[PDB]
């Protein structure tokens, strides 16, 4: 007699993983958060004085 | 120097306090103030556990100085054994209202 995990475990794992990755990638990259990464290797220094 | 006028416990204790004080004089212990002393605990000489109802919890300290106590309900009927050391206990129900 299959229980809830037997019947729906694979779909909850595959759906929850898919969902979690898609919504954190979207949040991290698409909405204007400023992570303020290191300028090293990234930023071309510019005259300020 | 001295003189009287203060009541004694014999005169004036009441309620449970008086019940305990009067049982003590009889050497009786209906309110479980003393630790019972073990028998050899064999099946011929079980520890006799008084109760007012049909079952009482026993704690067995199987060996002196153990820090773990083994707890179980002892039921009226044939003696039961501690599940750790096997020593025997037998329930002796009833009455306490003299």
């Amino acid at each position: 007699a299959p229980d809830f995990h037997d019947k729906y475990g694979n779909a909850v794992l595959a759906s929850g993983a898919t969902f979690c990755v898609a919504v954190w990638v979207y949040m991290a990259t698409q909405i204007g958060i400023e992570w303020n990464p290191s300028p090293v290797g990234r930023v071309t220094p510019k005259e300020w004085r | 120097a001295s003189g009287g006028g203060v009541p004694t416990d014999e005169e004036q204790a009441t309620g449970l306090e008086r019940e305990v004080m009067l049982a003590a004089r009889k050497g009786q212990d209906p309110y479980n103030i003393l630790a019972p002393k073990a028998t050899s605990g064999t099946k011929e000489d079980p520890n006799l556990v008084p109760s007012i109802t049909n079952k009482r919890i026993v704690g067995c300290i199987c060996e002196e100085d153990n820090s773990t106590v083994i707890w179980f309900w002892l039921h009226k009927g044939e003696a039961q054994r501690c599940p750790s050391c096997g020593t025997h206990y037998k329930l002796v129900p009833h009455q306490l209202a003299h």
């Binding site: 303020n36 990464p37 290191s38 300028p39 300020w48 004085r49 | -």
Partner: protein, 227 residues
């Protein structure tokens, strides 16, 4: 100052801060090794179907588990206290500067020869010049001579504050009625930043410290021009 994504201490600007860095590397390896060993045993205790559930004798193993930690704490404490005493050692400073904390800015007094004092306030974000650091620059920096032992004396004229410069290994509380002393010696010129380090009310986050370390002759002319 701190840089983005920084994981450890600001690089050392003074010999005591370098000592603290190597003492923290020593202590962090030990911290790493014991949390790893605990996580590993946990995993080892949880990954067998073999069982032993009868009473276990504790006395032998408790000798190991008290003596090996005692030996590790001695191995931490010995370099720890050597640094603690080295910082306290007598050193013959060349200059004394006082700083008084206030709500919400710092004043500085350099009164060994003439009566020099001034206030130092955060540059508001709307007034930063291009390239300047939000919340950390001040209008009047604490100019000091590089490569010289300086006695800093710290107090407050109101509530508690605390005067800190992480890259020199410095944090001394500013308490009204008390004059606390610390030593500062920078091995390099430059600008070295810190921030008030005891909650002091509405603008605690906005009363920073900026030291400017330069050669003595420049400090002497700057001090004359600030009179």
């Amino acid at each position: 100052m701190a840089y983005p994504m920084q994981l450890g201490f600001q690089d050392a600007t003074s010999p005591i801060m370098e000592e603290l860095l190597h003492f923290h590397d020593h202590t962090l390896m030990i911290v790493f090794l014991i949390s790893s060993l605990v996580l590993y045993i946990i995993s080892l205790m949880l990954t067998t179907k073999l069982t032993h559930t009868s009473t276990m004798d504790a006395q032998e193993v408790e000798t190991i588990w008290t003596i090996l930690p005692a030996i590790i704490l001695i191995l931490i404490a010995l370099p720890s206290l050597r640094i603690l005493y080295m910082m306290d050692e007598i050193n013959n400073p060349s200059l004394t500067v006082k700083t008084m904390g206030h709500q919400w800015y710092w004043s500085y007094e350099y009164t060994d020869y003439e009566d020099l004092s001034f206030d130092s306030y955060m540059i508001p974000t709307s007034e930063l010049k291009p390239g300047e650091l939000r919340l950390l620059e001040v209008d009047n920096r604490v100019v000091l001579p590089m490569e010289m032992t300086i006695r800093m004396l710290v107090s407050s004229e109101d509530v508690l504050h605390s005067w800190a410069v992480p890259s020199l290994g410095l944090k001394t509380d500013a308490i009204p009625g008390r004059l606390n002393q610390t030593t500062l010696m920078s091995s390099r010129p430059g600008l070295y930043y810190g921030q008030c380090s005891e909650i002091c009310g509405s603008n605690h986050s906005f009363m920073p410290i900026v030291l400017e370390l330069v050669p003595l002759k420049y400090f002497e002319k700057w001090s004359a021009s600030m009179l």
